[PDB]
Structures are given as structure tokens and as C-alpha cells.
Amino acid sequence: PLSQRFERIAVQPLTGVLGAEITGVDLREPLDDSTWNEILDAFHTYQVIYFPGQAITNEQHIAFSRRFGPVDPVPLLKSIEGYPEVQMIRREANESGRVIGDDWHTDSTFLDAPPAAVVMRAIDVPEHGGDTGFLSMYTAWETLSPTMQATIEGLNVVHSATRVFGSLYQAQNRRFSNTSVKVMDVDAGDRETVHPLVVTHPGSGRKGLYVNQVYCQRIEGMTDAESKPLLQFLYEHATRFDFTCRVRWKKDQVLVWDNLCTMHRAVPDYAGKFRYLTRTTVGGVRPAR
Template sequence: MPYETITAQSIAGALGAEITGIDLSSQLTNSQTAEIQQALWDHKVVFFRDQDLTPEDHLRIAGVFGEVYRVPFVKARDDYPDIIDIVKEPEDGDMYNFGGVWHTDASFDEKPPLGSALYSLQSPPYGGDTLFTNMEAAFDALSDGMKDMLSKLTAVHSAERNYGSGGYFTDDDNQSASMTINPDDSGDKETLHPVVRTHPETGNKSLYINPIYTMRFKDMTEDESQPLLDFLYDHAIRPEFQCRFTWTTNTLAVWDNRCTMHFAINDYAGHRRHMNRVTIAGERPV
């Protein structure tokens, strides 16, 4: 995709591009703003390395894409209630890392976030990469019969498995030293979303389900739903639909949460990894 004010270099066939030629700490021109938006719709996840950003810069860049989304259950920074600290300390060893299961952010919400802007304050010396997968490519590669059937289905989403009253984080052993997660029974609430959603900017269709927050298909039991969900998850994370990003300190990534899933790899025990995330509000999936 040709741009006039930035350069985009794809990092994989399916999605993901590194953007250069722009200093995000400066006041952006209208054309720069329009082009980084376009680059996100074109590439689904964009990476800006070597950006020296203050929290205000970080909030301002996220604001290019939409209003801020206040993340439930995860304690925010005391000084910036719209920024969450995603941190794993050396003493956390190989215990659970935030985002370490394939997911799209907060699909349990009636209006899940449009995207997230994740900034690396400290990257480990190796490991801690993030995987992304293209849910439009995954949908496109299905047979017409499967696409047709899925297009008629609705899925039940909930934060229950992670943040609900009996969820993973209610067990003290699963609380890390470094992040505060506050599960409560509002996490048990269920929300309905179409299994196939249409992107409001591009009109493209994508699969919209994920193994953390999708509980079952509407009007079906979990046992009935799970085999098809498992097939779709395996299909969606085929290597050719993915990209893998190796972080360096001071990189900002912005992903489109509506047509991707992501997965934070937990392979840097004994090292510190520190990220800040600003989440961008979205619309009700259709």
C-alpha cells in the first residue's frame, strides 16, 4: 500500500507491518494521522520502533483511532487511570503471563474495544514476542458451506473463565506479584456477538470468537459448541495466518481488535518485561 508520509514494511504475508518515517512524539499532521489510520486498516497490526513516548503521547496516539476504553478487572496505573501496566517481574518465573492464551481484547463487553496501543517500556533480552493472527484470512479460507453456517450463528461471550466469580484469577496462586487483577461477579455476565462480523471500515468479514471469552454458541450447550469452536481455533491459528513480533524497548504496537487475535509468549522467565497499554473504544459488532 503506498503512503506519502510514512513507509510500511510488511513483516509477514498475513498481517503486520513496521511503520517508519514518523515520530509519534511530535504533533502529527492531518495526512500523517490519516495514513497511520489507513495503515492499521490495511495491516491489522502496526509497529513503530524507537519511539520515545510519554504517557501523554501514548494516550494522544491511541486517540487517533478512537476514544479511550477503560479496562475492567485489571488495575490501572495510579497516575494514569486509562493506562494499564502489563508487567512480569523476574521473580514471577514462568507463572501465567497476561495475554498468554489466544484472544481478542474484552470480547465479553457489549462494545468490545476497537483496538489496543501497547508500548514497550522494557523488553526482555530474548523472548516475550507477541503473535497475531488474521481472522479475516481465517474466515476467507473456510468452505462456502461452513461460511454460510457460521454466518447464521451467534456466540455467547463472557469474562467468566478469567475474571468471573469462579474464574482463574480468584485463585490467589494465580495472582502474580506484579499485576493486580480484581475478579468479581460482574465477570459472569454473558454477551451475544455474531460469530462472523463485518469490519466497519473495510467491509471485510472475519471470524469473531476466541478461546478465553467465547463460552458457546447461542441456543447450544457447551458440549455441542466446543468441537466446532476447537476446529475454528485450530484453523484460525494456522501459521500462514499469523505474524510474530519481537519487541524492542520503546516500540508502540497498535492492533485492530475486531479482525485479529493475539497471544503473548511466556518464554523469558527470570527477566523483566514491562508494557503500558491504552485501549481504544469500539462499537457493537455486527
């Protein structure tokens, strides 16, 4: 049982698939080795973990994030004054632009080495509205038939940011506001990189599906017509409701998600209400089979 396996923290799973609430620890302070190792174990098992009631400073947020790996801010988001490492998911009450992250994805997979994790901190969130969905790409992979696994396990996939800040974004109407999003070079938006469709997580050693509808363009080697259906099936499969969990925010909730083996999604159900979280990004290494 969790109560006896964990001696320094308390772990309460959110679903039978992923997600867990962690209590019994003070993120204002340096973590001792035994406490950190339990958090890291829970992180690898539950893939998204969150800590209610952690009223921390920007420096403490950064220090906690550093336990997971080096900081490596994502390219698109603005930072707060004085802290380049601390980026903003901020939406003013009156804004009407596109909501950041409102499609299932994982972050910045157009990079040669996308983030390994993100540590998000709620600053000011609505009493209701603005939950975040998560899902497990371990589960998505593990629930494919043996025949479908054999069929796709050796494929590679082309990623780019073209629909977020490259040529395709610039040729359409739904735009982000300047509250949290920077102006970007279109050529950087169009730059392609190739990642495996199935990857091995370096911490857990487990295989997971690695495709997302925001940044994936096509299966490498295939035409668009050939790719379109396999990719669309995999998006529908991965985002099956029974592979998900739903996290509700409260002020001072600190959450870590695994940027390799989960996906996540914003929920734009709080029009007219201010919502502000900060986040630090933990750098990763090239996705690999």
C-alpha cells in the first residue's frame, strides 16, 4: 500500500491511469535525499503529480524544478520580470484571443530535444473553470493491438511549429494575444525535426506513444494522404476519455507533468475570468526508441 511504501510523503492517486496528489512535504525548503527519491518515484509512476497548498517564492519554484533537471525555457512564452526561468500562462479577464494549449499536445516537440518536464504553479485561478486535462501515452501505447503495435513501432514522425508560429499560423485567423506569447521568427516556426513514433522514457524505462496533433505534420516517408489516417486514428485513440485525468486548480497548487509520456490540454471554460499560472521548464534529451 502507498501508505507504507512511502515514508516521507503521502500519495493519493487521482485515477487508475495517471495523476496523484502529494502531501506531507514543504517545497519552500531543500528536499533531503530520501524525500526527493520518493517524489521522483511517484513522478515516474503517476506521470503528473501535484502538491496543494505550496505557497512558494519564484526562487523556491526554480529550486524545486532544478531537482528534475536543468532549466530550459520553452521558446514561445514570455517570462516574468527578474526571472527568465519563470514563464507565464496568463490570461486577462477581458481577453478574447486564442487560448494557449487548447488542443491535446505535449510541449515544444518541434525541438530536437523537447522538455522533459514542466513545473506549473497556480497564482490566481477561478473558483471553477480552467481545469487542465492530462493523459498517459504509456496507456495509449499499451492498449494498441499486437498487430497495430507491430505495424507502427518502427515509424518516425515529422514535427514542426508551423501551425503555432510558422507559415501555417501566419496564414490563418486565430491568433494568440501578447499577454504570454512572444513574436516569433516564421522560419523557426517551419523548421522540421524527426522523432520516433514510439519512445523509451529514460527514467522509467517504459515505452510510450509519441505523437500529437499540434506539432506532428506527417509520418516520415509517407504522403499526407497516407499519413493523415494513421495519425488521426492515433490522436483519437490516445485521447480516449478513459486514458485521461482532469486536474482542478487552486491557488498555490504546484504541479509537475512528464513532457515525454503524457499529453495535456487547456479547458477554455472561464470566459470573463482572470487566470494566471507560472511555469518552469525542465530540459530533456533527444527522444529515442
